[PDB]
Nucleic acid binder design. Structure first.
Lengths: 210, 149
RNA sequence: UUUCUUAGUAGCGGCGAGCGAAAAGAAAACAGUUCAGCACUAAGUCACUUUGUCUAUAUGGCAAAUGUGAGAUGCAGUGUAUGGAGCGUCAAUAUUCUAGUAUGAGAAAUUAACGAUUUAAGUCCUUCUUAAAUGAGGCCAUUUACCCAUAGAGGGUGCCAGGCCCGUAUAACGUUAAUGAUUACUAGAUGAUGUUUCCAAAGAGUCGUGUUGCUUGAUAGUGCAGCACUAAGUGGGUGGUAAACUCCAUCUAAAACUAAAUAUAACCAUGAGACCGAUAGUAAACAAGUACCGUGAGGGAAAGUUGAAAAGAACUCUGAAUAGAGAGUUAAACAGUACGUGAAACUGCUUAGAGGUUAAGCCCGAUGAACCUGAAUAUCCGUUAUGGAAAAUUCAUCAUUAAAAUUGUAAUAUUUAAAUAAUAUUAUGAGAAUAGUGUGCAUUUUUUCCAUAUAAGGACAUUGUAAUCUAUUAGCAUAUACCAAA
RNA sequence: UUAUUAUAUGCACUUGUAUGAUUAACAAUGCGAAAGAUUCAGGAUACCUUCGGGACCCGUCUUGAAACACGGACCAAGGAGUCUAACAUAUGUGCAAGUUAUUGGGAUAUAAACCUAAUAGCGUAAUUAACUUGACUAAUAAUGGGAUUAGUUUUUUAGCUAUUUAUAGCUAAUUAACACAAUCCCGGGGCGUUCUAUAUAGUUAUGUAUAAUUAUGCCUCUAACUG
RNA sequence: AGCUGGUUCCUUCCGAAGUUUCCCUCAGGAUAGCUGGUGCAUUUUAAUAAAUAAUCUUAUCUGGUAAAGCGAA
RNA sequence: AAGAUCAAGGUUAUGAUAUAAAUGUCCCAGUGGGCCACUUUUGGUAAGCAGAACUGGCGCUGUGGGAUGAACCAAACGUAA
RNA sequence: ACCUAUACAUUACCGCUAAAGUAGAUGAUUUAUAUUACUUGUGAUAUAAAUUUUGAAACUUUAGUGAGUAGGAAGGUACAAUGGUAUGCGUAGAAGUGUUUGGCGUAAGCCUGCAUGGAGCUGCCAUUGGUACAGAUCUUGGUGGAUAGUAGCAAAUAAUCGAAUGAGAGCCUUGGAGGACUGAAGUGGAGAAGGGUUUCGUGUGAACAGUGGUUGAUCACGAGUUAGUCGGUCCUAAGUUCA
RNA sequence: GUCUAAUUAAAACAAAGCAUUGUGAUGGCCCUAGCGGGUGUUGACACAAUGUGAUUUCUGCCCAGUGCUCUGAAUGUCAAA
RNA sequence: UUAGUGACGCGCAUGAAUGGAUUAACGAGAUUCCUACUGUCCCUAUCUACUAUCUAGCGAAACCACAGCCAAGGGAACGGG
RNA sequence: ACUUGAUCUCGGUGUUCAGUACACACAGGGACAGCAAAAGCUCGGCCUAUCGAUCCUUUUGGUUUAAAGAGUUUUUAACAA
RNA sequence: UGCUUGGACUACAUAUGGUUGAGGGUUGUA
RNA sequence: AACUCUAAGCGGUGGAUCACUCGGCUCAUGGGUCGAUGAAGAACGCAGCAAACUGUGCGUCAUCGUGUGAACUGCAGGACACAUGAACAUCGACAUUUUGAACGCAUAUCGCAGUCCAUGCUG
């Protein structure tokens, strides 16, 4: 009832002082989490501690499509051209989210090229030897030549300056866009109505012949 | 940050009633808690100051997911700020291998808005949604709007 | 799952008061799956009871009785719709490969956790003080640093102790877990993908629907439940505004298993605090959930501190004695068991003073008492003139010699290319001084002391007179102008 | 013609008058007399005394409290306008058409500091219920024009000062430009609403013809846009 | 708890109101008025007026009280 | 009729003044229980009564004065001669 | 004529407001002189003497004014903590505290002396608050006047002679003695319900017995409650515990 | 005869008497959310529920209103299914 | 005889188990007249025991702004100041 | 006598005093008229009272928007008065 | 046996195994 | 005079104030460890001297084993068994009462049975 006043939809009316997570544990958690990565990196092998192979392409928000969210999707279709081999993939890494329908087949291009520029980097270590299909190399052994094991998975992306404010060559200037942009949307709105008019025109003709 | 040494409540010791008037003493909730009664006692205070307080301007839109409508706006006031500064002077040149093709969509602005008056230099703007007026001044600058994914 | 967000919003709401989430987007952490239902088609399965063997300190495993019992009123098993199985084709396809157990490997190889040992170095002199040095000062040399130093974190110890001790830094040792390599034995499996073909088995009084109540943001239901009605497999559900029609997209319920991120006022093991400091802090620093109250549930305190060491006052005396007085002890009893320190309220005594005017208390002014505080120097018209005595030596009047700086200027570099400017470096000239010599280094000078002097030995303080100044008060003495009346 | 007054009265010296709060000539006395310490002056310290005058009990609600209003015997110590979330205004600070790292990760001399991926928040367009559309003018116009406004540059002139007379600065009059900010006004223009030009007309494309949805031509039914 | 009581150091400077309106309002708020603070823009109302603000006067309007009237409605 | 462009005008066209004024923000406290007097007045016989108009005090104000006293008179108070 | 308010006038002084300057120091300014230039008289320069190192987020300098509740702002003071610092203080006496020590400030308050003391502490600049008390029919602890004694310690008459002992003896310790009491429907002699060592001996002091008190239901130290037949047990009742 | 222990011991209360009401038990009246149970190891000369208040005497008129009741015309009005 | 009792009863606002009337016996019940009786009184006085009091011993509290001589006056319109 | 301006649309103004809400009134702009010979007048009653917020119910308006995976049609949410 | 003392056992719900059983549930041999 | 008032010194009374503190409080970190194999909690008896706290159960202030290596301590019995071990920790072997989920049934009763094994007495 204060005449510069800020209508207070501040809902602390329900004994909210019992709850309060003070978050005095933030860097204790950060230290623990980092410490845990150190344990995991050693424990799981010369295993490089993430990192599925990260699968992006194409998020769903029409605005939010450089908004890369990381490729858990498990790609049964994309496996095939990688030939590829769902079970074999799991030993390697291959994130098991079998429920995806990636039908924008530019998306099939990107991700298949990923797995292949990977895969050949998967140094093939089999538990005695003998070991079929490395297809590597005793010279090409993890320990001897290559020493790899990194990190964090780059969004890939691929800049964003953009600047496709390149030099084109730009012809289009007989092309009156503004009439067509309102027209295209109107055509879409009126599809069901335009369907009626055809149907009503058909009915009256049937009657007339009658 | 804070000192209660800079508080005047410190200074008001003693001052017997601590700035809270001897006659009418500041006692817990003199006017009724909050926005109460906004149809009664604070009616002056609400239409003053918040007026549209109370009723309805109804068109209940059940499950507006603000991803369908989100549509952020760039003005034709600005629009040339999508072009990096050292390239901005570079296409004032005069040299044509042209016209200026700016991708508005990857700069995250769904819609190009009308606002008006750009330099006569032709701009092609790659944009999802159009102001017809933004296009009208762009076409006067001799560019176009090429309509864009 | 949680956090960041959306969001104090979509939305709900006597649309009043007030309430309100998820999706996409961002991150932490990530991990996947299996029945049952198909033709295994010689129940392939399982519990138990005994005995062989094995060997934990087994409800164990191996083997035999093919001994009972369970089980076709159904269990193995492929296999779970995120599909899957069988044909053929492809494809990998091997004296093997993989797993589970046993193996300590690497002549005890390493890491962590614990117990726990480790130490590198002063208890040197002096002085204070004292109970104590841990205080103050000294400690060659290392460009004056006591010794030590990967440790100058803490506590204990008689104080402000890195060096007195324990620890701390830093590791040694033992144990236990990890890092179980080879190897042995046991068990099991031989891919996965794609094509074509044949099959394609799927949770029910539930889904759903009408009502009701409860609940949510969920609104022409948000979940949940009761009741009535009650399904189905080109089904079913979902697609936050009910319906029918026509579609699409999207999963696959009415079944089951599953780490991590995520919680933690209890418990155990631990570490911190611009936390509190004994009416505080937890109820409880303590024979504290005690003592104590209440029939009971329950209610539930107050209350820390001698000293370095008890050295806790022997002894003598008075008193029945507790106590007192002497004495001892103690650095101090001005620490003698409300005991560190020691307040106020209050009281006794002593000391001063008064007492019928307001009961008492009070402020100011004047004033006495006790009590206290403040207290300066050289000059009329100036303190300089003059004389003596001492001392100085870069300077003394200045010259020279050496030393380094300052003022002004320039260059070479940097700063800002370049300029001005500034800065580093370097150099020149002008000078001034710190040391040395020199007329003299008291020929003299200068520096430093002392005496005497003109009204006068004065101006801190208080006093006299007179001249003035500001505000003012109160008289004196001198002389006019005009008007009325006369 | 006479009287009166001021100027023509400089330089030296001066305990002369003032110099805008001009107290001192002159003098006496106490006395700083080494440490020690006399003597003088001055004092509502505590408190006592003596005299006059004044002093009614604080806190509080209340129009008014010394009240025959209420609490308070007396004293000590605890003891009451806070913290937090979210907010407005003032101001400072950082950066600024952007800002906020600390969700998290990299790292550590460690719950800190240093670094910081990516989003998201807010701002950068609003208004209609929403569909929707879009602030026009101009690269510019701090919204335009206009009226009051500063500060500057600036025409031209005057006075003053300094000056080498070249010259500059101040003050006043004055012409023009920016003139923001500040203040005021009439508008324009995004959105809604009304009257209504969007009566109708033009333009493009569909559509059609032609070559291969497209291009070209034509119509401008239809669809779209605009005054 | 809109009620009663109390609220903890000082000095300096300025300094109220018990009124308006609305309210189950009338022992209270909000609101306007009075109050302070923070400043800001300009001073011919400013730094070494030919621009006003608001009080007299003047000029120019208004009024139905005092008085008067009832042999005026 | 406005906006308004241009040219003409001795002295700015009552009087004192300006403690400088105007303007904005806080949406700030405090107030929403008044009390008294001159004058004017209504209700009431009247009241230290209930209620207006204008203005000043008191509220928030001692001091001097009315012997005394919230309010009346004189006067607004830094500290002293 | 006289008397007389914090009014009025003047003056010193406080504060607040106002108004103005102050910020070439390798420089400036004043004073005296020697030289030089011009001139009568002035400046320049040389020399000698003197002043000037400004919290210029203040001073110098100036004027006008001050009631004041509510309230607002401004600037300090005190208290506990913290980063930094004074190469801070300190058991040779810290902090604390009593204090007619001396002084400072309008005050908030400060320092110091003296006495007591015994182990640690403070000033300044920034930084944070559980930050300052007289009160709240405040809380908690302590203490007065009432009042070293005023209420009272008075119902059931209530003793008393007097031997013993001790520090003290009306009672309470007690005999003897003596006045009486309850007046066997008891102030007796037993038990349950209840009590919980209270019973009893010995020691016997302070506290307790609203008095004393050698004595006690006190205080200290010991001992004592023996059952086939009495109760519990057992049994059922009202009634209950519950598969 | 009873009571307001601790300010009311009565004229109040109770009380015999008097009258009124429901009920044959799958009931009446009653408890429990419910299960189940009280009255009731009771059976109308019983049990339950009321009102007035010995004896004597008297018990009038009023069902319009508000309660209560019914083999009542019960297509009044009238819910969900 | 503002009492009581018997009457009268247009009875403000009596009354019939909402019980009305009458009533023996009963009542630590309400009320009225007379008597007996008395310190209930006129009209006071004395006495017993225990206190109060004083003393040895023992020893609180209520309450308390500061506390305490009146009269009038003003003032919150009744003062210990 | 003739009629429906007691009209439509949008803004202002007065009162109340925040000169705000509300109601009613006053003068206009844009419509469209009504009347009279016209000039003119006329947004109710010569002037001064004659009545009501949000949500909500509903109607009338454009036939417009939404019912968030597409339509269509019922239903439904709405915006203007 | 008698009399007396010590230890170990004796709750309930329930699964499985054990064996005894059981019903005009129901089947069959006779 | 005494008393009273006022002040001061000293002594009481009283425990404020200061400085200390094996405690409290709050945040962070690691771990998951009761029970019919009889819990947590309760009761009961226990130390040379104890009455509690604390510890423990009838083997009672504690026993094995293990570690360390000479105390405990108020006074002492002890101290010896310091080289086989004090005493404290470790505590992995045992004990672990009467109870309590509490289990034969009860519980103003430590009350009363049944069963097996076993002992003495009598025979």
């Amino acid at each position: 009832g204060k005449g510069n006043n800020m209508i207070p939809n501040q809902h602390y009316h329900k004994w909210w002082q019992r709850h309060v997570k003070t978050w005095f544990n933030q860097p204790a958690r950060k230290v623990r989490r980092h410490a845990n990565r150190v344990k995991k990196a050693k424990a799981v092998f010369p295993r490089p501690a993430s990192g599925a192979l990260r699968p992006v392409v194409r998020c769903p928000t029409i605005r939010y499509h450089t908004k890369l969210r990381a490729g858990r999707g498990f790609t049964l279709e994309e496996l095939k051209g990688a030939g590829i081999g769902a079970n074999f993939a799991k030993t390697i890494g291959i994130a098991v989210d079998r429920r995806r329908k990636n039908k924008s087949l530019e998306s099939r291009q990107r991700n298949i090229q990923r797995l292949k520029e990977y895969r050949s980097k998967l140094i093939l270590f089999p538990i005695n030897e003998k070991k079929i299909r490395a297809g590597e190399s005793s010279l090409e052994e993890c320990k001897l030549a290559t020493q790899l094991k990194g990190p964090v998975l780059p969004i890939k992306n691929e800049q964003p300056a953009v600047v496709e404010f390149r030099e084109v060559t730009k012809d289009e200037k007989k092309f009156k866009a503004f009439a067509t942009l309102r027209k295209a949307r109107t055509d879409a709105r009126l599809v069901g109505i335009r369907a009626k008019r055809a149907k009503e025109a058909a009915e009256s003709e049937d009657a007339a012949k009658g | 940050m804070s000192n209660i040494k800079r508080k005047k409540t410190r200074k008001l010791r003693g001052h017997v009633s601590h700035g809270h008037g001897r006659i009418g003493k500041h006692r817990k909730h003199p006017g009724g808690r909050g926005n109460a009664g906004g149809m009664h006692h604070h009616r002056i205070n609400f239409d003053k100051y918040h007026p549209g307080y109370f009723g309805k301007v109804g068109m209940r839109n059940f499950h507006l997911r603000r991803q369908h409508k989100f549509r952020p706006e760039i003005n034709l006031d600005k629009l040339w700020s999508l072009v990096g500064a050292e390239k901005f002077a570079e296409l004032e040149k005069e040299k044509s291998t042209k016209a200026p093709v700016i991708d508005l969509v990857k700069f995250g602005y769904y819609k190009l808005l009308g606002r008006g008056h750009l330099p006569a230099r032709p701009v092609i703007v790659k944009a999802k949604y159009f102001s017809k007026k933004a296009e009208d001044k762009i076409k006067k600058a001799g560019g176009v709007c090429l309509l864009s994914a």
